[model samples]
Target: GSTGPQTTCQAAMCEAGCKGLGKSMESCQGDTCKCKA
Candidate 1:
């Protein structure tokens, strides 16, 4: 789980585990990610 200030960066880590280094398959929300798939 994430434990820090929320942001899309954290979402990338949670959803893609790539820190937004690749394609964002999900819609990243404010400090969270919405799984689109």
Candidate 2:
């Protein structure tokens, strides 16, 4: 699952290999953007 985009901008982008939150949780928050396993 994914939390969707972080910012309201259409051109917003996130970094590679962010490993967000944890390994099982492949998702992002409302105020934050990340990549996970």
Candidate 3:
């Protein structure tokens, strides 16, 4: 599990970017969630 404060993508575009970077998927927060990378 994610064990700390992660790098949350600020937008949907960022979300995709984060995913591309291999950021582990997490819960959404209004418009962002902590990305791994």
Go through the candidates in order and give the clash count of each: 1, 0, 1
For each candidate in turn, the TM-score is 0.23, 0.19, 0.37
| Model 1 CA lDDT for position 26 | 44
Q: lDDT of each model, Cα atoms only?
A: 0.44, 0.37, 0.54
Q: Model 1: per-residue lDDT, tens digit, 1-37?
A: 3233334634544556434544334434464554433
- Candidate 3 regions with alpha-carbon error over 4 angstroms: 1-11, 29-32
RMSD of each: 7.3, 7.4, 4.7
**lDDT tens digits, residues 1-37, model 2?**
4544344322223433333434322233554453442
Task: Compute the lDDT for candidate 2.
Answer: 0.37
Give the better candidate number (2 or 3) by lDDT: 3
Better of 1 and 3 by TM-score: 3
Q: In angstroms, give how far residue 28 of model 2 lies from its true place.
A: 5.7
Better of 1 and 3 by lDDT: 3
Worst-scoring 10-residue span by lDDT in model 3: 1-10
**Winning candidate number (lDDT):** 3
**Which segments of candidate 1 are over 4 A away from where they belong?**
1-9, 12-14, 17-28
Residue range with the least summed lDDT across 10 consecutive positions in model 1: 1-10
Query: 1-37, model 3: which lDDT tens digit per residue?
Result: 4422334544465457667977665535544465556
lDDT of 3: 0.54
